[PDB]
Structures are given as structure tokens and as C-alpha cells.
Amino acid sequence: GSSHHHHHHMDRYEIKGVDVASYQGDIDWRELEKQNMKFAFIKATEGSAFVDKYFSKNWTNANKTSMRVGAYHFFSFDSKGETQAEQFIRNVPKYKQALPPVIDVEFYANKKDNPPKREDVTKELSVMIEMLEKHYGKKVILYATQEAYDLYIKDAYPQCDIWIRSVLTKPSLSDERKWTFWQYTNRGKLSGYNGKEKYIDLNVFYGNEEEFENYGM
């Protein structure tokens, strides 16, 4: 069920941003910008053939603002990394000022009833990372939940930055790695004109404004 309390980010992290998919509906990007949202990661693709229905619109509209904007791919355990990379690449244009690409690795559907083997994830995810890093010229970010991190990402992928979900506690990775982004709530608290409780993910960057401005550059 739902509490009226919210989980907040730690005060030391002042660079905040959102991540969205089509399920967040019609987004007023100028209104998010007015709430000091500094970045957005927008869902583009999933698996080897799916395209989020609002990716095109969100990409165009978010990029009209001053926000730093990137795209994410929702990883599939059931198709090859090469095909998944090709799908993200067909959909997401190269743009020097964009944020680095994100691959989102987490459980979905029934996959947690019979978790994929780590070896099989390493093979396919490593191909994706190689292809995206080469194409966009930027170090790839891996988003994960705690369970997916512990089972697939921990003690691995030193060539990537980590974006960790931690919506109930302060953020920490089980191998003591440092995180680069932290997703701190699924139901971000929002002001301004249409302002209301919304199911939209909120996040912070680890560092300061200057680090932010130079991130992935």
C-alpha cells in the first residue's frame, strides 16, 4: 500500500533529476525544469524490438530545455546483446552534449522465478556495453536494483558507472563500490502548476554542479 511519507535524498546531493517511460504520460518538461530538475533519462528501447511510445516526443521536448538529457535501454534476458545494442542505436541519436547511454538491468515478468545465470548476462551485457561505448563515445551507465546488482553487476563492470535504486534506505553497493546516480523514490514529490503526487522516479547525481556539467564529456 501507499504511505503519505516520501523517501528523500540526502541533503549533500544537490543535483536532482528524473527518469521516465511512457507510463508517466504527457510530461511538461518546462515545468520539470522549473523544479530544478537538472537531468532526465528517458526510456527509448526494450529488448531487441520494442520502442517506448513516448521516446521520440520526450527526447525532442526534454532537449528543448536546459536539462541534460540521456536515454535508457531496458535489458532483456532473452535476446542477444548485439541485437539489443543495435536497437538502442537505431533509435537514439548521437549528440555530444547528451548524457551517456544507460542499460537498465532488473527483474521483470517471471524472470525472478528462475534467474538467468550470471555468465549469460555477462556475455550479452558486455557486448551491449562495448557497442554503445564505441558508438556514442561515452562510458556506459548501468542501472540496477539491489537484487540485480548483487546477482549480476557486483564485482564486475569496472568499465561502467553505476546507477543504483535505493528507495527505502541510504544508498550503498554490496562490494563497496561508489555509485554515480541514486534513484531515491518511485513517487516523486512535485510542486508547480499541475503539481501533485506523481508516479515518477527521482534521482540524484553523486557530485557537484561542475562535475555534472562535465559528466561524460
Number of amino acids touching a second copy (CB under 8 A): 35
Out of 16, 30, 135, 187, the only residue in the binding site for a second copy (CB under 8 A) is 187
Query: What angle is formed at CA 181 by the lines to CA 178 and CA 15, rounded to 5 degrees?
Result: 120
User: CB neighbours (10 Å) of residue 82?
Assistant: 14
Q: Which of residues 112-131 bind a second copy (CB under 8 A)?
A: 112-113
- Helix, strand, coil percentages for the chain (3-state, nearest 5): 30, 25, 50
Under the criterion CB under 8 A, does residue 95 sit at the interface with a second copy? no
* Minimum distance of a second copy from residue 141's CB (angstroms): 12
The DSSP letter of residue 40 is E
66 interface partner picked from a second copy, Mg ion, none, CB below 5 to 8 A per type? none
Q: Which of residues 9 and 177 has its CB atom nearest to Mg ion in the complex?
A: 177
Under the criterion CB under 8 A, does residue 194 sit at the interface with a second copy? no
104 interface partner picked from Mg ion, a second copy, none, CB below 5 to 8 A per type? a second copy
Q: Which of residues 43 and 177 has its CB atom nearest to a second copy in the complex?
A: 43
Under the criterion CB under 8 A, does residue 4 sit at the interface with a second copy? yes
The DSSP letter of residue 179 is P
Distance CA 19, CA 67 (A): 12
Strands 50-51 and 68-74: unpaired
Q: Which residue has the cell 527526447?
A: 59
Which range of residues in 5-13, 26-34, 60-68, 124-132 is near a second copy by CB under 8 A?
A: 5-13
Cα distances from 183 to residues 16, 86, 160, 201, in angstroms, run 10, 27, 17, 7
Under the criterion CB under 8 A, does residue 161 sit at the interface with a second copy? no
Distance CA 122, CA 75 (A): 12
Q: Which of residues 85 and 160 has its CB atom nearest to Mg ion in the complex?
A: 160
* Minimum distance of a second copy from residue 171's CB (angstroms): 11
- Count helices and strands (H / E) in the chain: 6, 9
Can you give the binding site for Mg ion, defined by CB under 5 A? 177
Can you give the binding site for a second copy, defined by CB under 8 A? 1-7, 19, 21-23, 41, 43, 46, 50, 52, 72, 74, 104, 106-113, 143, 168-170, 187, 197, 199, 201
